[PDB]
Structures are given as structure tokens and as C-alpha cells.
Amino acid sequence: HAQVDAEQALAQVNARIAELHKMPQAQVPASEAPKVNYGEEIRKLLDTAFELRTAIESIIAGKVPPVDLSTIPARVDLLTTSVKTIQQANHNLVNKVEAAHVELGFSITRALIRTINPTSTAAQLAESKADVLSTYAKVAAYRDLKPTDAATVYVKNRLNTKIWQTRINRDKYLLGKNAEGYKAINKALTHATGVWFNPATTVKQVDDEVKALDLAFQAALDRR
């Protein structure tokens, strides 16, 4: 094919939905979302994605489109951009001051409203897409945190995300098998939770606790 048709758009949306589902943040309860990294962004991406999937299969089935059909590829693309920018920020913006994640998050948030807004024009969609990518490039040049700084919300939420990730992985591998690995990771989780609750935890102390959690999951795995 040449142009992106509905079925390709759909398939892109479904690929984003599957990517989002693999993220730990996507599997925490709604009440935890504010306490993991981009947790609320990741829920809004899923909601937007489900919205777009419904409209697109509504279109494939031959009903009336809730949005201009010609904007569909741009809507999906703005989703795809928002997903990939969230994924990037997740990996690359770890040490940034809080303003980075706040500014990025707000940009993602505006874009997702535009993505589903039936009144969003092509120009408006492209504006949104450019704001997301540009915002990311800006905030990526923000100042880092020193290892010695007190851990900020983002940083604390990074530990909680790793804690959550470990819990999930624990419940999928070490459980009902590696009975003594389960106990080793639960000790690690217990200790990680403590660092997470302590209000004097420093940035370096979160970076190490995160290192400590995945080392111990692997270690538990290694020993069967």
C-alpha cells in the first residue's frame, strides 16, 4: 500500500496498546498511578488508544466517523509520538530536575486531548506533535540532579515503579517455583519500600536501590 488506511491505523493503535500494557505503570491500580513515573500519562495514553481503536473499527465497520477520516493517520501518529516520547523520557530523563517531567507530562497531556478531540484539525494535530517532540528536546537539556540531592517526587516515583515492576515479575516467575528466590526478592522489596518511605532518601540512594532491585531479581532468577 502507499497511504495509511484504517486497518493500518488500527494496527498501529493496537501495537501501541500492547506496548503500553508491557509497561509496569500500566499494570498498577489507578490509585497507584500518581505514584509511578508517567503513571497518569500512561493511563491517559491507554484511554486515548482505546478511544482511537473504537473509532477506527467503527470506521472499518462502515458507520459515521466520530472524527474527519482524513485526520485519522495524524491522530494515530500523534499517539505513537506520545507513547515513544513517554518511553524515551522513562529511560533518558532519569536524573532531570522535576520541571523536566512536569513540562513534558503537560505537553503529552495537551496532545492526547488533541488526539481524540473531534474538532482537532490537521494543523492543530501537527502543532501538537511538534510541541511534544520539541518539549522533549528542551527538557532533555535541563539540569541533572546531583547524587547528593534529596530524592524528588519523580525520583521517588522511579523507585516505586521499580518496586512495582519487581512485584509483577515476582508474581510471574519466582512465584510457584523458585520458592527461595521469592523470599530473596521479597526481602529486597521490603528494603526498597523502606528507602521509598524514608523522607531523607537522596537521589543516589534511589539510583542504588533501583540497581539493587533488578540485580536481586536476576540473582533470584539465576538460582532457578
Short mmCIF file of C-alpha atoms in Angstrom, two decimals:
data_model
loop_
_atom_site.label_atom_id
_atom_site.label_comp_id
_atom_site.label_asym_id
_atom_site.label_seq_id
_atom_site.Cartn_x
_atom_site.Cartn_y
_atom_site.Cartn_z
CA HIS A 1 0.00 0.00 0.00
CA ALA A 2 1.01 3.68 -0.05
CA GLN A 3 -1.36 5.76 2.07
CA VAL A 4 -2.11 4.67 5.67
CA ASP A 5 -5.61 3.07 5.57
CA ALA A 6 -7.92 2.39 8.51
CA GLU A 7 -6.65 -1.17 9.02
CA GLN A 8 -3.05 0.06 9.17
CA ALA A 9 -4.02 2.83 11.59
CA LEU A 10 -5.87 0.28 13.73
CA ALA A 11 -2.86 -1.97 13.68
CA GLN A 12 -0.69 0.91 14.81
CA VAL A 13 -3.07 1.72 17.62
CA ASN A 14 -3.15 -1.94 18.71
CA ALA A 15 0.65 -2.11 18.62
CA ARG A 16 0.75 0.94 20.92
CA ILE A 17 -1.80 -0.67 23.24
CA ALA A 18 0.36 -3.81 23.52
CA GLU A 19 3.48 -1.69 24.07
CA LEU A 20 1.70 0.31 26.83
CA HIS A 21 0.44 -2.89 28.51
CA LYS A 22 4.02 -4.16 28.91
CA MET A 23 4.95 -1.09 30.93
CA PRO A 24 4.82 -1.70 34.71
CA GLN A 25 2.99 1.62 35.14
CA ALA A 26 0.15 0.23 33.05
CA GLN A 27 -0.42 -2.65 35.45
CA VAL A 28 -0.60 -0.76 38.75
CA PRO A 29 -4.05 0.08 40.18
CA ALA A 30 -5.44 3.52 39.29
CA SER A 31 -4.77 4.66 42.84
CA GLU A 32 -1.05 3.95 42.39
CA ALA A 33 -0.80 5.75 39.05
CA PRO A 34 0.11 9.09 40.70
CA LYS A 35 2.96 7.33 42.48
CA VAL A 36 4.79 5.75 39.49
CA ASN A 37 6.65 7.61 36.67
CA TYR A 38 4.35 8.99 33.97
CA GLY A 39 1.78 6.77 35.61
CA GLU A 40 -1.13 9.07 34.81
CA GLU A 41 0.29 9.85 31.35
CA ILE A 42 0.47 6.10 30.62
CA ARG A 43 -3.17 5.63 31.72
CA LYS A 44 -4.25 8.55 29.55
CA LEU A 45 -2.34 7.11 26.61
CA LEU A 46 -4.19 3.82 27.06
CA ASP A 47 -7.55 5.60 27.28
CA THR A 48 -6.77 7.66 24.18
CA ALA A 49 -5.57 4.49 22.41
CA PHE A 50 -8.81 2.65 23.31
CA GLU A 51 -10.79 5.63 22.11
CA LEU A 52 -8.92 5.65 18.82
CA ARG A 53 -9.29 1.91 18.39
CA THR A 54 -13.04 2.16 18.86
CA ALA A 55 -13.46 4.99 16.35
CA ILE A 56 -11.27 3.25 13.80
CA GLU A 57 -13.11 -0.09 13.93
CA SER A 58 -16.29 1.97 13.90
CA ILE A 59 -14.96 3.32 10.60
CA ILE A 60 -13.91 -0.12 9.28
CA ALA A 61 -17.46 -1.37 10.07
CA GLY A 62 -18.89 1.47 7.92
CA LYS A 63 -20.59 3.74 10.50
CA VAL A 64 -20.18 7.51 10.68
CA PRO A 65 -16.66 8.56 11.80
CA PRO A 66 -16.61 10.46 15.13
CA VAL A 67 -13.73 12.44 13.52
CA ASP A 68 -12.68 13.53 9.99
CA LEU A 69 -11.40 10.33 8.31
CA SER A 70 -8.53 12.21 6.70
CA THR A 71 -7.15 13.12 10.16
CA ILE A 72 -7.05 9.51 11.38
CA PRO A 73 -3.39 8.79 10.41
CA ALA A 74 -2.32 12.05 12.03
CA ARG A 75 -4.22 11.14 15.23
CA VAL A 76 -2.59 7.78 15.48
CA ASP A 77 0.78 9.32 14.67
CA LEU A 78 0.34 11.84 17.47
CA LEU A 79 -0.47 8.91 19.78
CA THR A 80 2.56 6.99 18.56
CA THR A 81 4.73 10.03 19.09
CA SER A 82 3.34 10.47 22.64
CA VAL A 83 3.93 6.81 23.52
CA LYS A 84 7.54 6.86 22.18
CA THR A 85 8.31 10.19 23.84
CA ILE A 86 6.99 8.81 27.19
CA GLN A 87 9.13 5.70 26.63
CA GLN A 88 12.19 7.84 25.85
CA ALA A 89 11.69 10.07 28.89
CA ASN A 90 11.35 6.93 31.02
CA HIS A 91 14.86 5.84 30.01
CA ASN A 92 16.76 9.06 29.40
CA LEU A 93 15.37 11.75 31.74
CA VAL A 94 16.03 9.83 34.97
CA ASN A 95 18.24 12.37 36.68
CA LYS A 96 16.50 15.56 35.50
CA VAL A 97 15.00 18.13 37.86
CA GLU A 98 11.27 17.90 38.42
CA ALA A 99 10.42 20.68 35.95
CA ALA A 100 11.52 18.47 33.04
CA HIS A 101 8.96 15.72 33.75
CA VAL A 102 6.22 18.22 34.68
CA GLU A 103 6.67 20.14 31.42
CA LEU A 104 6.89 17.03 29.27
CA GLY A 105 3.87 15.47 31.01
CA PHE A 106 1.76 18.59 30.42
CA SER A 107 2.75 18.62 26.74
CA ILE A 108 1.80 14.92 26.41
CA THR A 109 -1.47 15.71 28.14
CA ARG A 110 -2.37 18.52 25.75
CA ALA A 111 -1.53 16.26 22.77
CA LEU A 112 -3.78 13.43 23.91
CA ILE A 113 -6.76 15.74 24.20
CA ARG A 114 -6.00 16.99 20.65
CA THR A 115 -5.62 13.37 19.51
CA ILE A 116 -9.25 12.49 20.26
CA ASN A 117 -10.87 15.94 20.01
CA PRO A 118 -13.27 15.63 17.03
CA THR A 119 -12.57 19.30 16.26
CA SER A 120 -8.77 18.90 16.01
CA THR A 121 -7.64 19.97 12.53
CA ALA A 122 -4.61 18.63 10.66
CA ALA A 123 -2.71 21.82 11.52
CA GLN A 124 -3.63 21.52 15.19
CA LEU A 125 -2.54 17.87 15.24
CA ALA A 126 0.83 18.77 13.70
CA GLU A 127 1.19 21.66 16.18
CA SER A 128 0.64 19.13 18.98
CA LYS A 129 3.10 16.66 17.53
CA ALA A 130 5.76 19.35 17.19
CA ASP A 131 5.12 20.58 20.73
CA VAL A 132 5.59 17.07 22.13
CA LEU A 133 8.87 16.44 20.28
CA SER A 134 10.17 19.94 20.84
CA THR A 135 9.23 19.95 24.54
CA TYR A 136 11.16 16.69 24.90
CA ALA A 137 14.27 18.17 23.24
CA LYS A 138 14.07 21.24 25.51
CA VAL A 139 13.62 19.35 28.82
CA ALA A 140 16.37 16.85 27.89
CA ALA A 141 18.78 19.80 28.13
CA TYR A 142 17.59 20.68 31.66
CA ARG A 143 19.98 20.33 34.60
CA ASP A 144 20.57 16.94 36.20
CA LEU A 145 20.19 16.21 39.89
CA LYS A 146 23.33 15.80 41.97
CA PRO A 147 23.67 12.32 43.59
CA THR A 148 23.75 14.16 46.91
CA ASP A 149 20.37 15.93 46.46
CA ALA A 150 17.23 14.82 48.29
CA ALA A 151 15.20 12.47 46.12
CA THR A 152 12.38 14.30 44.38
CA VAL A 153 8.88 13.08 43.52
CA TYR A 154 9.96 11.84 40.09
CA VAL A 155 12.89 10.02 41.66
CA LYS A 156 10.82 8.50 44.47
CA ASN A 157 8.27 7.53 41.81
CA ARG A 158 11.07 5.87 39.86
CA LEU A 159 11.83 3.58 42.82
CA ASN A 160 8.13 2.79 43.27
CA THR A 161 7.91 1.91 39.58
CA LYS A 162 10.84 -0.50 40.00
CA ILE A 163 9.26 -1.86 43.19
CA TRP A 164 6.03 -2.42 41.26
CA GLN A 165 7.84 -3.92 38.28
CA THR A 166 9.64 -6.36 40.59
CA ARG A 167 6.36 -7.33 42.27
CA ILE A 168 4.80 -8.14 38.89
CA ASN A 169 7.85 -10.05 37.68
CA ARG A 170 7.96 -11.82 41.07
CA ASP A 171 4.35 -12.90 40.64
CA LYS A 172 5.13 -14.24 37.14
CA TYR A 173 8.41 -16.12 37.64
CA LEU A 174 9.68 -16.65 41.18
CA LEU A 175 6.22 -17.50 42.47
CA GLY A 176 5.01 -21.10 42.45
CA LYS A 177 8.54 -22.29 41.52
CA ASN A 178 11.72 -20.70 42.87
CA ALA A 179 10.34 -20.67 46.42
CA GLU A 180 13.59 -19.30 47.91
CA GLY A 181 14.05 -16.70 45.18
CA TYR A 182 10.59 -15.39 46.06
CA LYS A 183 11.90 -14.87 49.62
CA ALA A 184 15.09 -13.14 48.47
CA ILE A 185 13.26 -10.65 46.25
CA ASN A 186 10.62 -10.07 48.97
CA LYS A 187 13.46 -9.12 51.31
CA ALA A 188 14.78 -6.78 48.60
CA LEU A 189 11.27 -5.39 48.03
CA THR A 190 10.86 -4.86 51.80
CA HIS A 191 14.14 -2.95 51.88
CA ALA A 192 13.23 -0.96 48.76
CA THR A 193 9.90 0.03 50.31
CA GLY A 194 11.84 1.36 53.30
CA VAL A 195 14.03 3.58 51.17
CA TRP A 196 10.84 4.68 49.40
CA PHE A 197 9.10 5.72 52.65
CA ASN A 198 12.14 7.41 54.23
CA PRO A 199 11.81 11.18 53.50
CA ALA A 200 15.60 11.71 53.71
CA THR A 201 16.42 9.31 50.86
CA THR A 202 18.85 11.01 48.44
CA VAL A 203 18.90 10.80 44.64
CA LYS A 204 21.94 8.50 44.77
CA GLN A 205 20.15 6.33 47.32
CA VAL A 206 17.25 5.79 44.87
CA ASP A 207 19.62 5.07 41.96
CA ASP A 208 21.33 2.37 44.10
CA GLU A 209 18.03 0.90 45.39
CA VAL A 210 16.86 0.57 41.79
CA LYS A 211 20.16 -1.12 40.89
CA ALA A 212 19.67 -3.31 43.96
CA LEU A 213 16.17 -4.43 42.89
CA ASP A 214 16.95 -5.67 39.37
CA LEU A 215 20.25 -7.22 40.47
CA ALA A 216 18.26 -9.22 43.04
CA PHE A 217 15.51 -10.20 40.59
CA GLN A 218 18.16 -11.51 38.20
CA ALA A 219 20.02 -13.18 41.09
CA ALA A 220 16.78 -14.86 42.18
CA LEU A 221 16.22 -15.93 38.57
CA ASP A 222 19.83 -17.13 38.18
CA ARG A 223 19.36 -19.62 41.03
CA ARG A 224 16.46 -21.22 39.09
#
